[PDB]
């Protein structure tokens, strides 16, 4: 990507905020316990795969 | 909403037309359905796709909490326990299978699904049959009655098979023994409780005498009123020529006959 601004006299940042998925299943299967499955699939990180 | 327990369990643990039925999904997903057929072909890319992907290669799950909630939920629907100890039971015997699982224990448990089912369903039959817990009180209670009477013993008899026939063809009465006598109630939560013992032994006196007395009301009297009500209920059993006519028990017998039989007709003619 190429990005092109105005100059600015001070430090600036340029966020970009990749749209993404993003979900959790949360598994509860005896009495007081919570197992979770994260996701996030266009920056993978998580358990499923 | 439905007894068995394998139905009303399997409505809790499944998704919807998902590819736990194989069949049906692959013969949709291809064409083979008639319903609506090409449903299949215009949907989403990502969709097909994952069903595709799910139909060639299926993903394998873990029935231990399917059988689990059948049989506590058969435990429920059959009075072993309350709800709240259902939600309770479920996860105890969860906890019990998930520390001492082998195949054996999934053998075993398949088998006792089974079972429950079965034990359900013949509870609800037995239940709606005739209830032989009663016809087993009112035997010893008959065996702990004498089997002779001096005065007249065909009417005797008589009347006692027509209470056993009373008692085993209408189911929810109630036979038992409370204290040192035998009771029966036509219902429970029924009113027209029957002092079976006390109107025996006051029966004992009227069987073969009371027949040329009946004319007169001079031992009218001696009939008390628990015993009047225990015939009343025997009035649509014991028709006529099953006790002997003209006998002050054999007239009050014939007057209630009589008596519930216009009721009943005119009732079903009702309009």
Do not use: C
Request: no cysteine; aromatic share 8%.
């Amino acid at each position: 990507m190429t990005f092109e601004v105005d100059p600015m006299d001070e430090p600036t940042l340029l966020y970009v905020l990749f749209e993404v998925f993003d979900v959790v299943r949360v598994h509860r299967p005896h009495r007081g316990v919570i197992e979770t499955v994260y996701l996030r699939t266009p920056f993978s990180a998580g358990n499923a795969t | 909403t439905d007894p068995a327990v394998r139905a009303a369990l399997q409505s809790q643990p499944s998704g919807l037309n998902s590819t736990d039925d194989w069949r049906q999904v692959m013969d949709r997903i291809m064409s083979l359905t008639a319903r609506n057929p090409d449903a299949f072909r215009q949907q989403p890319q990502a969709n097909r796709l994952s069903a595709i992907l799910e139909a060639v290669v299926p993903a394998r799950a873990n029935p231990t909490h399917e059988k689990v909630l059948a049989i506590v939920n058969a435990l429920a629907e059959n009075r072993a326990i309350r709800p709240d100890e259902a939600g309770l039971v479920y996860d105890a015997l969860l906890q019990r299978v998930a520390r001492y699982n082998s195949g054996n224990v999934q053998t075993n448990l398949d088998r006792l699904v089974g079972d429950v089912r079965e034990a359900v369903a013949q509870r609800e039959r037995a239940q709606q049959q005739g209830n032989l817990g009663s016809m087993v009180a009112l035997n010893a209670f008959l065996s702990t009655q004498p089997a002779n009477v001096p005065r007249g013993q065909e009417d005797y008899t008589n009347f006692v098979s027509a209470l056993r026939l009373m008692v085993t063809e209408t189911p929810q009465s109630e036979v038992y023994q409370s204290g040192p006598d035998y009771f029966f109630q036509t219902s429970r939560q029924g009113l027209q409780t029957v002092n079976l013992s006390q109107a025996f032994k006051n029966l004992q006196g009227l069987w073969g005498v009371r027949a040329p007395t009946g004319d007169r009301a001079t031992v009218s009297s001696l009939l008390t009123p628990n015993s009047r009500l225990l015939l009343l209920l025997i009035a649509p059993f014991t028709d006529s020529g099953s006790v002997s006519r003209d006998t002050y028990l054999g007239h009050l017998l014939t007057l209630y006959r009589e008596a519930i039989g216009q009721a009943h007709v005119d009732e079903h003619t009702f309009q």
